[model samples]
Target: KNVEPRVTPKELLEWQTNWKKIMKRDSRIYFDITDDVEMNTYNKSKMDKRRDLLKRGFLTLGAQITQFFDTTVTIVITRRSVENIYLLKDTDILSRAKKNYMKVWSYEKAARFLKNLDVDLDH
Candidate 1:
């Protein structure tokens, strides 16, 4: 069991805000889409399909916490049958729009170096 803190969302938000400043670097956020219809709908090879999901608005602001509150840490995503990597590519879009792809960020450079996922924010 873990110790409980007399904490609130406001205090947590403040702490996250401070950490946000220190973590100025780019990071890809992950969300687990549990609906089987939605989870595996994204095509790995189609950029427009992803953009359409964003345009049509499939997620809500609080949707990111769907699984965490249930105590399940598994990520349910629209995965492809084939192995494919989210990569760094020139989309020919606006400047810095390239960084909006996908990746994870951490405080340890050594871990990144050793793992070598080649995680660029450009995705």
Candidate 2:
């Protein structure tokens, strides 16, 4: 059940307009930034909402965050995936367990991250 709406009507209208634009994109991807300056506060409810969005195939993106005191060190885009494969074992500087290991990288470098996995939408 949804909690009672705390947002004002004006806020709802503003949010709705922006939400529409986000969903209208060809790529159902979205990015978010939480800075210690303006958007400093971190809410568990907000994070939960992003996870829910992920369930809907909405890529709510986020980036690196250094120390909380450092205002400039924030918003770094990174993506990761992990899987297990039999009869294949490899090692690299960043990883060793080729069967069950974390695979992560930035989109600016290459698009291979998504290619390895099947993640596409009809719309």
Candidate 3:
């Protein structure tokens, strides 16, 4: 006979419930930048030095997903991932991810939703 059930399942269930609650309550998270000027300049600057810094782990790239229930989500990811999101057309990204069996993230989901909404994302 089994002495007792393990606590792992209970803990995992609690965590899952908590996560769902949090996701429901705060669905739209924003990416804040206190220094607007600096950030704008940085984005406009050339990528030569930035690339080297990213290679050395000093800087990271992120993709921002917005307009989902009027909320914004910023996901930090590899440079290659960011590049693909920005470089490829929205539909292209969706198709490629589906063909490759890639796990879609918030960004990809937003792309599809926005496409359906007929919203223009002029990047």
Candidate 4:
């Protein structure tokens, strides 16, 4: 019932990189923290929290596939009840210190656009 070219993570990364250069803008990244207990638990260690961040990031990354065209896509983080937006540093890439709080870039633009959810990123 479905016939379409599979969109790979590599493709998404490529597209994002291309668009970013053309737009001369960086993507605003955020991790969704839904549960207080889980958040508290994960918040304990740098390793623990980083794992949670990656887990949430993958959820949004997976949801990017089903979408058509370049529009805003909002992915609901399963482990998070309330989605919060955080900005990713300029030096940060999809594969890489993204785990540090200093890498936790939060912006007012994201706040206005994203609202009560995770990253309100354009795809």
Candidate 5:
């Protein structure tokens, strides 16, 4: 079992706020589809189709929480990110994010590295 860190309510609130903002931006983003058709399938067929969709371009979010010497870092994962993870044959999200130069923030310290300046400037 993974050990749970002692997190404060304020830190949790900050993380939730940041997470919601990310979800809001990601909610409207979708992959373009060319065609669709009805197909008869077994019980697991739809599940398989959804999995394939994820592999294609579907946007899904996964959170990876890691504990360092004195701080905890949280990283967001996307479908494309998973593809890279597989390409590099990495066993964990942290390693994948590190190698790919993805964003890694700390909820405990509320520090964000490599912020997206373009998106921030537009707003």
Candidate 6:
């Protein structure tokens, strides 16, 4: 999901805000990424909230990583939808998929339907 401006805060914020609006406009659900990175590291919950997020393919985050001798560092622009996430299967590239997702999810509804998942939190 890595893209231009070397992934600046302004771009990241715009992506977050725009994706949130997209979610609100399309789904009955509401999500906030302020909890994303932390959840990835500290939630320690077996509940895989991200499965739905990833399956829905509603959004994506691009990153650039830098490494130091001891540890690694990463930079990502929060989350922004594929512009066309639904088209990912047929689309040749990430950007194309994003554009398609944007168009496919333009409606003020749940853009895509979700099914009950059999996820457990005991992992």
Give the per-residue lDDT of model 1 (tens digit) for 7-51.
766776676555443333322233323222233335432533543
- List runs of model 2 lying over 4 Å from the truth: 1-7, 30-53, 57-123
Give the residue spans of candidate 6 off by over 4 A: 1-5, 29-123
What lDDT does candidate 5 reach at residue 107?
22
Q: Put down candidate 4 lDDT per residue, 4-120, tens digits, no spaces.
A: 658876776686656444323333333432233543434546434544544444345342322221213222222322223334334432112223321332233323323323344
Clashing pairs in 4: 34-80, 34-81, 87-105
Put down candidate 5 lDDT per residue, 4-116, tens digits, no spaces: 76886677668766765564443232221211234456624753454344323212233222222111222442323233334544645545456655553332112121122
Q: Per-residue lDDT for 7-119 in model 2, tens only?
A: 86777667655644433442222122322223323654554454344434334222222223222322222322222223223432123322223232343322332222233
- Please give each candidate's TM-score: 0.20, 0.21, 0.26, 0.21, 0.27, 0.23
Best by TM-score: 5
Ranking by TM-score: 5, 3, 6, 4, 2, 1
- Which is the winner by TM-score between candidate 4 and candidate 6? 6
State in Å the error of residue 75, model 5: 14
lDDT of 3 at 75: 27
**48, model 6: CA deviation in Å?**
8.1
Per-residue CA lDDT of model 3 for 1-123, tens digit only, reads 887767667676686566444444543332111211333556635333433332222111122223231213322212234334545654553334444444333434434433433334442
In candidate 2, the residue pairs with backbone N, CA or C atoms under 3 Å apart (3 or more residues apart, or in different chains) clash, namely 63-76, 64-76
Candidate 4 TM-score, C-alpha based: 0.21
**Alpha-carbon lDDT, every model:** 0.31, 0.34, 0.36, 0.36, 0.36, 0.32
RMSD to the hidden true structure, all candidates: 15.2, 18.2, 17.0, 14.9, 15.0, 18.5
Candidate 6 lDDT over 25-103, as tens digits, reads 5432222122213434334242234433442443322221212111121111123342434544442333332333322
TM-score of 5: 0.27
lDDT of 3: 0.36
